Amino acid sequence: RELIVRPDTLRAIINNRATIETTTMEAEFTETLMESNYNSASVKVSAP
Amino acid sequence: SQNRKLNVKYIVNGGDYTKIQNTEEWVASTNQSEHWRVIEVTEVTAVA
């Protein structure tokens, strides 16, 4: 619904300052874990 | 860990603002009267 009566003219100002803005953000993260174990046992028994 | 941030901004005030991303064409259009704008103000007077 039209709330106001159509005016004969409009009050305006001119502004043509165009702007372009681009932002890029990259993030990386890497985490490597390594573990290792070894156990050894040797036994020897003798007699004649 | 790695981070990268890139930010680009273009601003135009006068000339053909549709050539904001094309520097050569904006420079070519700077001689057209219909696009001349106020680029700085060197004197300001209080309205009173």
Chain A contact for B12 (CB, 8 A cutoff): yes
Which method was used? cryo-EM
Cβ contacts of B16 within 8 Å, gap of 6 or more: B25, B26, B29, B32, B35
Measured between alpha carbons, how far is B22 from B31 in angstroms, rounded to an integer?
16
Gap from B45 CA to chain A (nearest CA, Å): 20
Gap from B35 CA to chain A (nearest CA, Å): 9
Q: Give me the amino acid identity at B42.
A: T
Task: Tokens for B6, please give them.
Answer: 């890139």
Measured between alpha carbons, how far is B30 from B15 in angstroms, rounded to an integer?
5
